[PDB]
């Protein structure tokens, strides 16, 4: 993917996540846990659902047409009847092939973008109180129990509150 999140800095997917498509795992003072993120999941699904309907219109009735299988050899007219049909099929075949490749390419980058967006959104909340570990995991430099974690998951985490604690814990060192 262009964002290098899925199959990238996030080394792999979670088979044990049936809640949703994207989400969090965490370890803290109260143990370990897991939670799906609804918005990102839903964002991805709404784009993928009925994706093809945005290009191919609801398929239409067609009745009498031209003959396409011939008993006898006629020459000129039949040559043209066949060529017309042959030309149409090939043009539609090209179309379907291309449409599949586009959509699928679009579906991938879309989903990689939703992963990256959720990571970036999360980071911006944590501010100076966390460290990007490279896994797609955050080292949070303060005590952050389940209510603290939920607050991050629901966009209500206030970094000012924890800044002082995090600074102690971060700068506990320096040769």
């Amino acid at each position: 993917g262009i964002f290098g999140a899925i199959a990238g800095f996030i080394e792999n997917g979670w088979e044990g996540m049936v809640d949703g498509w994207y989400g969090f795992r965490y370890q803290n003072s109260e143990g370990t846990g897991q939670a799906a993120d609804l918005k990102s999941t839903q964002a991805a699904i709404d784009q993928i659902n009925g994706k093809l309907n945005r290009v191919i219109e609801r398929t239409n009735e067609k009745f009498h047409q031209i003959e396409k299988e011939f008993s006898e050899v006629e020459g000129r007219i039949q040559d043209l009847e066949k060529y017309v049909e042959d030309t149409k099929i090939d043009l539609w075949s090209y179309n379907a092939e291309l449409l599949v490749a586009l959509e699928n390419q679009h579906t991938i980058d879309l989903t990689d973008a939703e992963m990256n967006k959720l990571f970036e959104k999360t980071r911006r909340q944590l501010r100076e109180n966390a460290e990007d570990m490279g896994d797609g995991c955050f080292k949070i430099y303060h005590k952050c129990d389940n209510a603290c974690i939920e607050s991050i998951r629901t966009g209500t985490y206030d970094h000012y509150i924890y800044r002082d604690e995090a600074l102690n814990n971060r700068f506990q060192s320096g040769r």
Binding site: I6, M17, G20, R25, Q27, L52
Partner: protein
């Protein structure tokens, strides 16, 4: 500890599946869907559209009234089904531009006939043959009327028939091609016949060609068949001094959604909105690889038999 770690991820499944993109020839995603309807139902569903099984009859033969096709008089249809084993069983004939007449009637969607009172003074009507035996008796196409001489007279026929109905009438008529000069005189006093069917707009005369053809149902004679469309307020005028195979009336042309289709598949009590010679098939997909020949609400025919559209992210398992 005195810290906490918060990890971000996405999901994965055990049963991943391969699809193509612009970047990769093959790549595993969490889920995908067939866009190409490959499987047919194996039978033509009787229901959604009005289907008519021609059985032993062709569309053309049913409308001319080949006796063994009497059952199909009165019938209309959305789709007429023509079977391979169908056979003609009446006077041997041809139709210049057969294919077009078949196309025209197929669209009309009916072979319902409306008789008209033509007056043929001088001649004798309802000529029959051993070619179509209605029962064990000699007969002829029910929709046509073979005129031969009476006494020793075949007077220059001249009949007129106006259209006031407010739609097009389709008249089916013909000319007889006898086998010998001895026959051409015997049946029609003149030594060469002629048929001039005319309107104001159009006009078409046919001279009967003469001679031996191969035997078919004990007959070396033939009949050639033509049609004439007669617009509202116009008029049909038939002039002939020999060999006329006269019309008994008109068909009504409709601007219909009807068609004909060649197939040997059986009809059955299911439901479907799209029909191929291979049987009914399903609507739900955008493309289909069953048959270029279709009727009704059908997916688009393409060459390829599978196309997978991804409906999920890339599947990235661990092991």
């Amino acid at each position: 500890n005195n810290t906490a770690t918060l990890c971000l991820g996405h999901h994965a499944v055990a049963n991943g599946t391969l699809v193509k993109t612009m970047s990769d020839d093959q790549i595993e995603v969490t889920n995908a869907t067939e866009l190409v309807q490959s499987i047919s139902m194996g039978k033509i569903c009787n229901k959604s559209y009005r289907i008519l099984d021609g059985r032993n009859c062709t569309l053309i033969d049913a409308m001319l009234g080949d006796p063994h096709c009497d059952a199909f008089q009165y019938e209309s249809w959305d789709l007429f089904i023509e079977r391979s084993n169908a056979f003609s069983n009446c006077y041997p004939y041809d139709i210049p531009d057969y294919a077009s007449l078949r196309s025209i009637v197929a669209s009309s969607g009916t072979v319902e006939f409306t008789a008209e009172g033509f007056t043929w003074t001088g001649v004798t009507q309802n000529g029959r043959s051993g070619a179509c035996k209605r029962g064990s008796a000699d007969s002829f196409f029910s929709r046509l009327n073979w005129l031969t001489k009476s006494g020793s007279s075949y007077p220059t026929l001249n009949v007129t028939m106006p259209n006031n109905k407010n739609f097009d009438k389709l008249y089916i008529w013909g000319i007889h091609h006898p086998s010998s000069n001895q026959e051409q005189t015997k049946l029609y006093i003149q030594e060469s016949g002629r048929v001039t069917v005319s309107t104001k707009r159009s006009q078409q005369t046919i001279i009967p060609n003469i001679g031996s053809r191969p035997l078919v149902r004990g007959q070396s004679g033939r009949i050639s068949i033509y049609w004439t469309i007669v617009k509202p307020g116009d008029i049909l005028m038939i002039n002939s001094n020999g060999n006329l195979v006269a019309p008994r009336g008109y068909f009504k042309l409709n601007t219909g959604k009807s068609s004909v289709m060649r197939s040997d598949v059986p009809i059955d009590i299911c439901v479907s909105e799209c029909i191929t010679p291979n049987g009914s098939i399903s609507n739900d997909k955008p493309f289909q690889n069953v048959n270029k020949v279709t009727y009704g609400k059908c997916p688009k025919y393409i060459r390829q038999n599978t196309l997978k559209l991804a409906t999920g992210m890339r599947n990235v398992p661990e092991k």
